[PDB]
A paper describes a structure:
Kinetoplastid RNA (kRNA) editing takes place in the mitochondria of kinetoplastid protists and creates translatable mRNAs by uridine insertion/deletion. TbRGG2 is a 330 residue protein and contains two main domains, an N-terminal glycine (Gly)-rich region composed of GWG and RG repeats and a C-terminal RNA recognition motif (RRM). Unlike these editing accessory proteins, the T. bruceiRGG2 (TbRGG2) protein is required for editing all nine pan-edited mRNAs. TbRGG2 binds RNA and modulates RNA structure and these functionalities have been shown to be to be essential for its role in kRNA editing.
To address this question we determined crystal structures of the domain, which encompasses residues 203 to 269, from the T. brucei protein. Two apo RRM structures were obtained, one of the RRM(L209M) mutant, which was constructed to aid in crystallographic phasing and one of the WT RRM. Both structures were solved to 1.8 Å to final Rwork/Rfree values of 15.1%/18.7% and 16.5%/19.7%, respectively. The WT RRM structure contains four subunits in the crystallographic asymmetric unit (ASU) and the RRM(L209M) structure contains one. The RRM molecules in the two structures are essentially identical; the Cα atoms of the RRM in both structures can be superimposed with root mean square deviations (rmsds) of 0.4–0.6 Å. The structure shows that the TbRGG2 RRM indeed harbors the characteristic RRM fold composed of a five-stranded anti-parallel β-sheet surrounded by two α-helices (36–37). The TbRGG2 RRM structures revealed no interfaces significant enough to provide stable oligomerization, suggesting the domain itself does not oligomerize. Consistent with this, size exclusion chromatography (SEC) experiments revealed that the RRM domain, even at high concentrations (1 mM), elutes as a monomer.
Residue numbers in the entry: 199 to 269
The structure:
Amino acid sequence: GSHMRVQVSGMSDETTWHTLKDHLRQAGEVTFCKVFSGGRAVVEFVTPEDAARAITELQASELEGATLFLR
């Protein structure tokens, strides 16, 4: 649901679906990940607690040199 969903932006253009999913395993189990051009993505986790963990802990985390923005 919406509570399990997180918007990711700020990724390097070349960062892939695989790489992002791997990174967000530090928030919890990913059930959905969709990557758009320009370093954007939408991710869903198993639980709302995972999504909250992503936003609160992985905010401004670095991925392949780029600083992420999560909300």
